[PDB]
Amino acid sequence: PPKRKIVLLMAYSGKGYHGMQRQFKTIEDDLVSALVRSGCIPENHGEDMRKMSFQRCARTDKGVSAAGQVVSLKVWLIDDILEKINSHLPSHIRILGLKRVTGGFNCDARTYCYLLPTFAFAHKDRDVQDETYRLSAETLQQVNRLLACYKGTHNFHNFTSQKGPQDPSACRYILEMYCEEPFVREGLEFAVIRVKGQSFMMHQIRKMVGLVVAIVKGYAPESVLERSWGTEKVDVPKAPGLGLVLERVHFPLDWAQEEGKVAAFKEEHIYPTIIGTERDERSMAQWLSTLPIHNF
């Protein structure tokens, strides 16, 4: 059949993979295998992805989920391509939309959400640290007041991680950040933080979240947030990657018909895996226990 460039809207639960792009397999391994098996691309294009002009918008890290990843590639446009690809994927990865595009077609503005147990906001001394903890309206206000401080453009140099010495200037722009009202599943309360920004740096969102957890739990005074903008280095706690979900990438390309499917997949596949892992493996709880190591 005809060779065309297409773009895919893809979603996946990230647990059990080492990221989108190449030691667990990666999401692209599952996608490349489905493409090969479905007959969309020849074996040598699976062996060397550069040969099908494969590109991904976001190089999601180990364990990170996505409701709205986008990739582009050249394929033979076989009949029922979407169903055929999906038939070779496990249930926790799905192609949600697929469009043919020009060949003039080739990412930095994104929305993420971060799903976490609400005891991440329980005060170390005044609240219980167990899962019976319930977020007060007052604590959620404090959380949202602190997260709103991130909006605008600031020097986020303390919110990344360098191999070598820290780069003293790392200005970045944040359009919005807030925490939604909590919800409960089998006695476990969670909430979703959403952030929209541009050109997120390695570990930036995880440390943005980690600092507000540290403040709200009582390890650091609120002053530390404005202070962290300054030239001095600050050791900002880095919350785990488990809860992080790529929700939307912004570049024309209109994924509006697919929003119902995006929501359904987040609800049925992405969030239950995060919840179940927090319940069974206590990732957040264990991470919070490390907060005393930070010198504030």
Curated annotation (Swiss-Prot):
Keywords: Cytoplasm, Disease variant, Isomerase, Mitochondrion, mRNA processing, mRNA splicing, Nucleus, Phosphoprotein, Primary mitochondrial disease, Transit peptide, tRNA processing. It is linked to Myopathy with lactic acidosis and sideroblastic anemia 1: A rare oxidative phosphorylation disorder specific to skeletal muscle and bone marrow. Affected individuals manifest progressive muscle weakness, exercise intolerance, lactic acidosis, sideroblastic anemia and delayed growth. Pseudouridylate synthase that catalyzes pseudouridylation of tRNAs and mRNAs. Acts on positions 27/28 in the anticodon stem and also positions 34 and 36 in the anticodon of an intron containing tRNA. Also catalyzes pseudouridylation of mRNAs: mediates pseudouridylation of mRNAs with the consensus sequence 5'-UGUAG-3'. Acts as a regulator of pre-mRNA splicing by mediating pseudouridylation of pre-mRNAs at locations associated with alternatively spliced regions. Pseudouridylation of pre-mRNAs near splice sites directly regulates mRNA splicing and mRNA 3'-end processing. GO terms for biological process: mitochondrial tRNA pseudouridine synthesis; mRNA processing; mRNA pseudouridine synthesis; positive regulation of transcription by RNA polymerase II; RNA splicing; tRNA pseudouridine synthesis. The keyword Transferase does not apply. It comes from the Eukaryota. The gene is PUS1. Its EC number is 5.4.99.-, 5.4.99.12. GO terms for cellular component: cytoplasm; mitochondrial matrix; mitochondrion; nucleolus; nucleoplasm; nucleus; transcription regulator complex. The chain holds residues 81 to 399 of 427 of the full protein. Monomer. Forms a complex with RARG and the SRA1 RNA in the nucleus. Belongs to the tRNA pseudouridine synthase TruA family. It catalyses: a uridine in tRNA = a pseudouridine in tRNA; uridine(38/39/40) in tRNA = pseudouridine(38/39/40) in tRNA; a uridine in mRNA = a pseudouridine in mRNA. Changing residue 21 to R: In MLASA1; uncertain significance. It is an enzyme of class 5 (isomerase). The active site is at residue 61. This is Pseudouridylate synthase 1 homolog. Widely expressed. High levels of expression found in brain and skeletal muscle. Disulfide bonds: none annotated. The lineage of its organism: Eukaryota, Metazoa, Chordata, Craniata, Vertebrata. GO terms for molecular function: chromatin binding; pseudouridine synthase activity; RNA binding; steroid receptor RNA activator RNA binding; transcription coactivator activity; tRNA binding; tRNA pseudouridine(38-40) synthase activity.
